[PDB]
């Protein structure tokens, strides 16, 4: 299918991005192309953040540290595949995405499934659980059936 072929090409672009980055930094155009637009056969994990120094968002800073550990653990995993990717959207680069999602703070972790829209449990319950990488990994396994076993140096 034309669509199947274009999907395959899209996935190859994400795999090329993976050779240079563990986490894809997105603006609104990239978010829409790779996360909102069909076709997809992969899950996307997104950290919505605000890391600019002038904002001094302490929680975003700590959560990014744990997200980095998680995405590194994925990169080195025997589980690594083209069926799951990690992204981030910073408020100051993707303000339009935050507006579309009705978000006026950070951070938030979401899973965007390949088919359909996020379900209730596709927003990580940060305010209950905290954001240890191991807890993010447990949530990802619950939502995607991908098991990332976190490594720490």
């Amino acid at each position: 299918s034309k669509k199947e072929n274009l999907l395959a090409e899209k996935v190859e672009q994400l795999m090329e991005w993976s050779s240079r980055r563990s986490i894809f930094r997105m603006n609104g155009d990239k978010f829409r192309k790779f996360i909102k637009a069909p076709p997809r056969n992969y899950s996307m994990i997104v950290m919505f953040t605000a890391l600019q120094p002038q904002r001094q968002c302490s929680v975003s800073r700590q959560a990014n540290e744990e997200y980095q550990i998680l995405a590194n653990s994925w990169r080195y995993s025997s589980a690594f595949s083209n069926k799951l990717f990690f992204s981030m959207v910073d408020y100051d680069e993707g303000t339009d995405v935050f507006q579309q999602l009705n978000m006026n703070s950070a951070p938030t972790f979401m899973h965007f499934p390949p088919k359909g829209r996020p379900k209730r449990a596709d927003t990580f319950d940060l305010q209950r659980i905290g954001f240890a990488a191991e807890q993010l990994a447990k949530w990802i396994a619950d939502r995607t059936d991908v098991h990332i076993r976190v490594f720490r140096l």
């Binding site: 605000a50 001094q56 968002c57 302490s58 935050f98 703070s105």
Partner: peptide
């Protein structure tokens, strides 16, 4: 409006 702790 956007807000974050510290």
């Amino acid at each position: 409006k956007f807000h974050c702790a510290n």
